[PDB]
Amino acid sequence: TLKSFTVEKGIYQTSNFRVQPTESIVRFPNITNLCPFHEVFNATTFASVYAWNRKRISNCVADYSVIYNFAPFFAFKCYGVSPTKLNDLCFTNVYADSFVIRGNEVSQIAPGQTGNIADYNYKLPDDFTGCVIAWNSNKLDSKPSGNYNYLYRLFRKSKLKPFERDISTEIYQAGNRPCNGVAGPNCYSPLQSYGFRPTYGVGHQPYRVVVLSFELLHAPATVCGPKKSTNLVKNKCVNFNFNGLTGTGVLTESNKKFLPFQQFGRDIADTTDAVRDPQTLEILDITPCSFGGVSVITPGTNTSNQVAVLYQGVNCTEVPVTGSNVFQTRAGCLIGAEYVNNSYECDIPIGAGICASYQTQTSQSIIAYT
Amino acid sequence: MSLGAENSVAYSNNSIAIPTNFTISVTTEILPVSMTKTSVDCTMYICGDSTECSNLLLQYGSFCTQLKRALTGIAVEQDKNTQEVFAQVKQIYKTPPIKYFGGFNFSQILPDPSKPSKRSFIEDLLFNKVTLADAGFIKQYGDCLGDIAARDLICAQKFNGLTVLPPLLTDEMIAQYTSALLAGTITSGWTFGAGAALQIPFAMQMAYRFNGIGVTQNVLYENQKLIANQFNSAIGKIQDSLSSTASALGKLQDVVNHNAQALNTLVKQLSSKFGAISSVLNDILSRLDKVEAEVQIDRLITGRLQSLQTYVTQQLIRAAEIRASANLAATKMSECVLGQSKRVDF
Amino acid sequence: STECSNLLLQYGSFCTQLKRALTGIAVEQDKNTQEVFAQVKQIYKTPPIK
Amino acid sequence: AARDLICAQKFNGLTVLPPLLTDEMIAQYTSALLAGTITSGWTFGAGAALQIPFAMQMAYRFNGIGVTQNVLYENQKLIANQFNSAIGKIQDSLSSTASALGKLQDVVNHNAQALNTLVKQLSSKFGAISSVLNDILSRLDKVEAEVQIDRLITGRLQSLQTYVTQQLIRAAEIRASANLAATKMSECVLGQSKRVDF
Amino acid sequence: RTQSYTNSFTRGVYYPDKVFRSSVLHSTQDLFLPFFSNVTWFHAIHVDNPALPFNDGVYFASTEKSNIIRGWIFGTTLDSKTQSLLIVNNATNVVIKVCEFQFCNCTFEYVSQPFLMDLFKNLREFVFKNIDGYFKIYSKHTPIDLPQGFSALEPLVDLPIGINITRFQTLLAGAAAYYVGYLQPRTFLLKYNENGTITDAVDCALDPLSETKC
Ligand SMILES: *[C@@H]1O[C@H](CO)[C@@H](O[C@@H]2O[C@H](CO)[C@@H](O)[C@H](O)[C@H]2NC(C)=O)[C@H](O)[C@H]1NC(C)=O
Ligand SMILES: *[C@@H]1O[C@H](CO)[C@@H](O[C@@H]2O[C@H](CO)[C@@H](O)[C@H](O)[C@H]2NC(C)=O)[C@H](O)[C@H]1NC(C)=O
Ligand SMILES: *[C@@H]1O[C@H](CO)[C@@H](O)[C@H](O)[C@H]1NC(C)=O
Ligand SMILES: *[C@@H]1O[C@H](CO)[C@@H](O)[C@H](O)[C@H]1NC(C)=O
Ligand SMILES: *[C@@H]1O[C@H](CO)[C@@H](O)[C@H](O)[C@H]1NC(C)=O
Ligand SMILES: *[C@@H]1O[C@H](CO)[C@@H](O)[C@H](O)[C@H]1NC(C)=O
Numbered sequence A: 001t002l003k004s005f006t007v008e009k010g011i012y013q014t015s016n017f018r019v020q021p022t023e024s025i026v027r028f029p030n031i032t033n034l035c036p037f038h039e040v041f042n043a044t045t046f047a048s049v050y051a052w053n054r055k056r057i058s059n060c061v062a063d064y065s066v067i068y069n070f071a072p073f074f075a076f077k078c079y080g081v082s083p084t085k086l087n088d089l090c091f092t093n094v095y096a097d098s099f100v101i102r103g104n105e106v107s108q109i110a111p112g113q114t115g116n117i118a119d120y121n122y123k124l125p126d127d128f129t130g131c132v133i134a135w136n137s138n139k140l141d142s143k144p145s146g147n148y149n150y151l152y153r154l155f156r157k158s159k160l161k162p163f164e165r166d167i168s169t170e171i172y173q174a175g176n177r178p179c180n181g182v183a184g185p186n187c188y189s190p191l192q193s194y195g196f197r198p199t200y201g202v203g204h205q206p207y208r209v210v211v212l213s214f215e216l217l218h219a220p221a222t223v224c225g226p227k228k229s230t231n232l233v234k235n236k237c238v239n240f241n242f243n244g245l246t247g248t249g250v251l252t253e254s255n256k257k258f259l260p261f262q263q264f265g266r267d268i269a270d271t272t273d274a275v276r277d278p279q280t281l282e283i284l285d286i287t288p289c290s291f292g293g294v295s296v297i298t299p300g301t302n303t304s305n306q307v308a309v310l311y312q313g314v315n316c317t318e319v320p321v322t323g324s325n326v327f328q329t330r331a332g333c334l335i336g337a338e339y340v341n342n343s344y345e346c347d348i349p350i351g352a353g354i355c356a357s358y359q360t361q362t363s364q365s366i367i368a369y370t
Numbered sequence B: 001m002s003l004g005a006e007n008s009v010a011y012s013n014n015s016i017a018i019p020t021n022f023t024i025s026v027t028t029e030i031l032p033v034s035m036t037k038t039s040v041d042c043t044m045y046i047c048g049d050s051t052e053c054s055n056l057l058l059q060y061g062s063f064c065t066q067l068k069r070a071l072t073g074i075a076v077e078q079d080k081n082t083q084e085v086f087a088q089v090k091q092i093y094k095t096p097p098i099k100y101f102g103g104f105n106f107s108q109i110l111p112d113p114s115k116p117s118k119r120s121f122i123e124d125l126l127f128n129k130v131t132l133a134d135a136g137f138i139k140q141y142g143d144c145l146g147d148i149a150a151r152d153l154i155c156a157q158k159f160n161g162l163t164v165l166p167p168l169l170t171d172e173m174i175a176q177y178t179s180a181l182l183a184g185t186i187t188s189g190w191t192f193g194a195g196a197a198l199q200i201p202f203a204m205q206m207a208y209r210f211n212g213i214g215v216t217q218n219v220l221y222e223n224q225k226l227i228a229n230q231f232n233s234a235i236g237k238i239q240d241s242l243s244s245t246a247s248a249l250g251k252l253q254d255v256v257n258h259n260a261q262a263l264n265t266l267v268k269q270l271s272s273k274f275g276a277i278s279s280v281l282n283d284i285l286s287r288l289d290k291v292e293a294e295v296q297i298d299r300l301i302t303g304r305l306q307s308l309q310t311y312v313t314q315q316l317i318r319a320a321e322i323r324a325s326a327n328l329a330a331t332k333m334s335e336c337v338l339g340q341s342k343r344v345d346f
Numbered sequence C: 001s002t003e004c005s006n007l008l009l010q011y012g013s014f015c016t017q018l019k020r021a022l023t024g025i026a027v028e029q030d031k032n033t034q035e036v037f038a039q040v041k042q043i044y045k046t047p048p049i050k
Numbered sequence D: 001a002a003r004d005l006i007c008a009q010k011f012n013g014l015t016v017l018p019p020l021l022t023d024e025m026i027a028q029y030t031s032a033l034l035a036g037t038i039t040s041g042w043t044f045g046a047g048a049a050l051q052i053p054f055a056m057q058m059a060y061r062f063n064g065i066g067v068t069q070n071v072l073y074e075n076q077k078l079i080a081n082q083f084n085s086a087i088g089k090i091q092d093s094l095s096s097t098a099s100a101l102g103k104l105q106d107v108v109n110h111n112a113q114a115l116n117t118l119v120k121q122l123s124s125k126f127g128a129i130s131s132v133l134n135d136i137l138s139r140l141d142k143v144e145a146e147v148q149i150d151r152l153i154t155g156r157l158q159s160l161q162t163y164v165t166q167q168l169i170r171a172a173e174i175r176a177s178a179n180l181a182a183t184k185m186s187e188c189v190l191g192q193s194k195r196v197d198f
Numbered sequence E: 001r002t003q004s005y006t007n008s009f010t011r012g013v014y015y016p017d018k019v020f021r022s023s024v025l026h027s028t029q030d031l032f033l034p035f036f037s038n039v040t041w042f043h044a045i046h047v048d049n050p051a052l053p054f055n056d057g058v059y060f061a062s063t064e065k066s067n068i069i070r071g072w073i074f075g076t077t078l079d080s081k082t083q084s085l086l087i088v089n090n091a092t093n094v095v096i097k098v099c100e101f102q103f104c105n106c107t108f109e110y111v112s113q114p115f116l117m118d119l120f121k122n123l124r125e126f127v128f129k130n131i132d133g134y135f136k137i138y139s140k141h142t143p144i145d146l147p148q149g150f151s152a153l154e155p156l157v158d159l160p161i162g163i164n165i166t167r168f169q170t171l172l173a174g175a176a177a178y179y180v181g182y183l184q185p186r187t188f189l190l191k192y193n194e195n196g197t198i199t200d201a202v203d204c205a206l207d208p209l210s211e212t213k214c
């Protein structure tokens, strides 16, 4: 730690000691049903973008690796998460929105985008934490005579707020002359239809879009991943996986006053202090494993190679594993130097009126004194 | 605001004013000497036993050795400050059991063996007025590891690598140094600040002090009872002033509060996101792949390093100010306790 | 700017530290002037004869 | 027609607070110190002000420096004329040369140039496409403008922290000089000093 | 109708999230009812149009010692096109619809204990907010004009209705008295005690003293 081969007399702070974890536990709820992504992904027909569907996926285990066998897309477009880590973490509610758009407008299914689809048809929030899946469909959504079952909205008095629908079909009035049903030169019906034909370019093909919106942990968790659970162990340094929250620490029974709706506890530095087990409803404190600071008291390298080691801030009935003499000091206990009843001037300072030195006894050794 | 009361000296070129009586007065000056010695671990603060953050922090640079060197230099500097101010006598003197120092009491500044810590009554008041926080290793890693229904800031800063080192000299040794200085000053005068201690009766020493300030020594010997009573009443007045008013020690209390709020701000800066998707490394490493979590962890590493460097720079400036005050206190102990000073208002 | 202000509140708490440091500096300058000049308890006046 | 630097720094949030004591109050403090010094001597710094003629006070000062007091009373006119000529020479040297106050003028110049470079740091790009936030808002979508705004925020925060650190160091130096000035006022105006070249 | 006006002193404080915090002064920005706001007292007696607007939040508070208020029908146009919450105190069901039949097609239907479990005046405070296509109902049953003191409101129930709300109307079924106040986006400073309850709060827009406190 000094980047040198010779060490002068003094006390040096080298590193910190840590109690390494021994076991690993995983705690997931008791959920056995399978999520119906299949019912979402192949259907006889989808809906228009102004009347987009929404399916609630809840109380099931979700496998996201069977998505690739249902539709011939290229890759996920995930915001906030990554598609390869979707099996290692658990949500509370997953929604699925299904609609068909043109290939020009797939780029408007991103957060923070404006245009025509993202203004009057389907608007995403800027805090989006989901994945957008879009694939070409020219063999099911197009006809040689023209497929006119898909509609979209051009005219609307205001912009759509995120995650809301407008299935109203009323005649727009952009002019100053009221019509109330007459589609004149100033009143138009704001639902035009795509003229989908198979003999188009690649930018005008229909594209089936499925948008998965994830809801993070603010509740008891319902839509988890396919991972087995482990028996709960307490009073030991382990690794825990409580509902996708990963950390290292010890677990103790708590005497806290958690309300029924609350599930987590947080500290001043916004780290998790207490957690509620998902299988049995009990509260467990999360205390980090035992640590501290290690200081090395040595004389010069030219003098000798004897070393005393000080563990800062602990009473050492708590060291997991230098010399064999143990002396307790207010600055943590000192191992490797015996305590003599004399008193000399301070050679190497330790703290709280205790110093150390390399002196004889009658056979040279490191001694500690006041 | 009012600058002061209006006055006009009745000046004339054949008129003088000469006092006919005096007043012995005891004042009080409070000077900071040292401050809290802190020790900061980088890996527990910035990363907190995450292997990926530790690898990126090793890949980042070598700023943490510089921060550790600066904080170690500050701690050794405060130990040097306390040793410079208090350790000025080579022998621990002792007072005689008879306490008749010419009618002067000296009973509230000399130690008494009733308390386990041999401190005087005014020293007990001065240690009672300052509400000390982070006094050293008082938690000792046993209360933090247990279950407390209301966690304090000390455990939250201990779990993030922010510790407090104890001072080298305990308060018993500081009280012993001040007791030795008081015994040498009472029984010797200024002769123990030059060579060996020379005993002298306290009345004759006080006559030497009056000869020092420019007054003939017959004034003291003909008014010894009045001077002793005035000194006792001044000691009683500063007794009642230290007992009643709690705003006198607002320099030392400000030092303690400054160190506490600096450590509290350093703890509270861990909850900031610094542009990343979350402020915790575990959710970033669990919700993302390697490539994107590298960018988010890099943003958090840069933010926490900037916060730690800001803390270290402010600590360096505060240590320079405290060292200047400690040099002033050492000069005052050398020139006013070990002798008589002719400097005006020093 | 609303977006910059939202990102600055999202950033951290550096600015309260900067404001606290500048306020301590200004109070220190006022204390400097007070402890240099205001050393006398009364405002004396010279006589009209000079 | 030509904007000064004060408006350009006031429009960007950099202000200057007034001092607590006005210049009239400092002049009153110095006038009270002068009146006490020339009508009482050093006695107004210990207890009450005790009047004494100025010849007897100067005899006290010569007895302080080690010269017997009969030197003044036999050479009072010569000493008074020398003091008046010295005061006239100080007046002439202050009227002719303006380079004596180059500590206070440097303090003013240092603060002015620090605020001026803090203003001038707002025209830098810091790796972004523009130094104007409004062009970044109007020219880009949300995602890219967040990146450019983050770069500008980091650069401006670094510049402002550098300014604050330099101000703290200058304030520590100014406080040391103020402590020296307070010691000089306490020891040399309120009494006679035995320290060599103080 | 008998429209009246009174003062809501300190009520309307609810838990902003579902995270346990103890001995922590937390600062939140959400849609709260402002302190010392001017709320409306309704002495509606039928022997009277309850078609109130919504405006981003409803404080709804009734001092009824009995259970004579059924529920609240939300929405924009309520002329048998799309209705809303049809809560009944029959202790069997809370039915939510996106359809007709305002009073006598099934959306999310919910079964639990009745809201009015108890029989002093026993003020009932509710919070109805609708942001990001999600709707929350906070409630706290305070046993006893509006009283003095900070009483926190728990998220007793949540509801995924996902519909637009512009108006708000209370359904009775003789003499009734209920308060309606409006939520605004404001910044608060809540005080959690050692048991995790919010016993006090500071509104950061009322007076300069509270702004200094924040
Ligand atoms: C000088 O001052 C002291 C007090 O500062 C005077 O002592 C007081 O004298 C009165 C009158 O006899 C007593 O009632 C007080 O009890 C005395 N006080 C103390 C503390 O002894 C003293 O008389 C003054 N001397 C002259 C000559 O004026
Ligand atoms: C020196 O001062 C102390 C402190 O006031 C005196 O102790 C007091 O003595 C009186 C009478 O004996 C008691 O009523 C008080 O309770 C004592 N105070 C304390 C704090 O113990 C002491 O008497 C003085 N010395 C002399 C010689 O009189
Ligand atoms: C919930 O999980 C526990 C885990 O031990 C199990 O015993 C119990 O049967 C589960 N409940 C249901 C309804 O499956
Ligand atoms: C969808 O379901 C049908 C019948 O359930 C099945 O034949 C078909 O292969 C599935 N996939 C697609 C892409 O249509
Ligand atoms: C450390 O542990 C021992 C034994 O459990 C205990 O007696 C002691 O008080 C503890 N603390 C210190 C500071 O030694
Ligand atoms: C509320 O407003 C009404 C009129 O808008 C007014 O008469 C009444 O006094 C107000 N109540 C207050 C300020 O408490």
Ligand SMILES: *[C@@H]1O[C@H](CO)[C@@H](O)[C@H](O)[C@H]1NC(C)=O
Pocket (backbone or CB within 6 Å): E098, E099, E105
């Ligand atoms: C059911 O509700 C839908 C709208 O959600 C409406 O179109 C339909 O007409 C309703 N059914 C009947 C029988 O009215």
Ligand SMILES: *[C@@H]1O[C@H](CO)[C@@H](O)[C@H](O)[C@H]1NC(C)=O
Pocket (backbone or CB within 6 Å): A158, A161, A164, E076, E164, E165, E166
């Ligand atoms: C709800 O409907 C109204 C129609 O009065 C409309 O103006 C508004 O945009 C809609 N959406 C809201 C309030 O989110």
Ligand SMILES: *[C@@H]1O[C@H](CO)[C@@H](O)[C@H](O)[C@H]1NC(C)=O
Pocket (backbone or CB within 6 Å): E193, E194, E195
């Ligand atoms: C917390 O709850 C306990 C248990 O009833 C009670 O004794 C204590 O007074 C409560 N604390 C506060 C601050 O109300």
